[PDB]
Amino acid sequence: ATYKVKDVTTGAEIEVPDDKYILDEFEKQGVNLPYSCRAGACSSCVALISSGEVDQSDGSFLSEKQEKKYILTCCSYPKSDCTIETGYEDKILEDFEIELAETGLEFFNLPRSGEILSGVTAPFEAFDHYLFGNGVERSININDVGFNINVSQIPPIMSLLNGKNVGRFDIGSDFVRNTALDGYSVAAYLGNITMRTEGVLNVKSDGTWQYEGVIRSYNDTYDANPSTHRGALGEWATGVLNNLSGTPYEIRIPGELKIKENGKKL
Ligand code: FES
Numbered sequence: 001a002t003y004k005v006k007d008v009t010t011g012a013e014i015e016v017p018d019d020k021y022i023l024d025e026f027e028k029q030g031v032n033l034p035y036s037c038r039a040g041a042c043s044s045c046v047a048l049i050s051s052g053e054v055d056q057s058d059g060s061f062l063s064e065k066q067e068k069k070y071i072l073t074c075c076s077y078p079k080s081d082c083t084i085e086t087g088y089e090d091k092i093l094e095d096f097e098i099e100l101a102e103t104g105l106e107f108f109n110l111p112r113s114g115e116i117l118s119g120v121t122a123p124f125e126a127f128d129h130y131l132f133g134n135g136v137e138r139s140i141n142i143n144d145v146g147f148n149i150n151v152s153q154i155p156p157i158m159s160l161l162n163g164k165n166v167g168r169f170d171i172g173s174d175f176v177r178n179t180a181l182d183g184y185s186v187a188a189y190l191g192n193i194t195m196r197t198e199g200v201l202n203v204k205s206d207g208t209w210q211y212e213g214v215i216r217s218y219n220d221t222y223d224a225n226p227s228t229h230r231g232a233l234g235e236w237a238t239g240v241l242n243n244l245s246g247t248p249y250e251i252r253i254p255g256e257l258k259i260k261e262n263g264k265k266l
């Protein structure tokens with residue numbers, strides 16, 4: 001039989017006999033491709049295979065898991081129509097990194113889009129999205145993050161409560177939230193964010209006070225590259241980033257958190 005082998009890199013579509021190697025037949029039709037050994041023992045001729053199947057049993061360089069994703073074009077016979085991407089030598093991954101992507105898809109899943117699942121997996125999902133999400137925006141409602149914000153932690157409010165100010169004050173101010181205050185799980189994907197509180201603070205002459213309002217969040221940019229933030233990644237995440245490049249992305253945090261507190265200054 002013969003099969004059609006479409007190559008996304010060059011655009012060529014070549015009929016390749018099931019008893020001829022893909023490289024040789026593309027060359028025969030005038031499409032020059034990369035190679036070195038031509039003997040199955042290197043990655044010069046490697047191509048991504050996105051659809052179809054080959055017999056590349058003549059080659060030796062790729063692992064069993066790598067052969068699910070890539071082909072050595074010098075020693076591959078097509079067994080069905082195929083879609084490949086030549087010149088992929090610069091982009092092939094080793095087993096531990098192919099399986100990291102697969103696992104994340106299956107564990108968290110359109111995939112790697114929209115809402116982030118609330119709870120203990122959030123910083124894991126966020127890191128996986130950094131690695132494999134290609135910069136697509138994600139979201140989590142402010143009420144699903146697990147913020148634990150109190151007035152003592154909001155300097156625009158405390159500035160009025162700490163001075164001798166009596167009356168009714170309309171507060172509308174941004175402030176930086178170090179989400180370490182909200183727990184390691186949140187800090188591990190949000191870090192420092194900018195938030196906004198809007199509300200009313202009422203302070204009596206005797207020091208009794210009440211605050212009522214809302215808190216909203218501006219969008220945050222997720223970027224795990226260590227030079228862009230405060231946190232230790234740890235040895236495992238450092239390792240992953242020594243082998244894969246991620247893509248920053250925006251996290252949209254919509255909604256209002258209600259805040260209502262009261263006290264008495266002495
Ligand atoms: S050119 Fe070395 S494996 Fe194909």
Ligand SMILES: [Cl-]
Nearest residue numbers: 162163164165
């Ligand atoms: Cl004062």
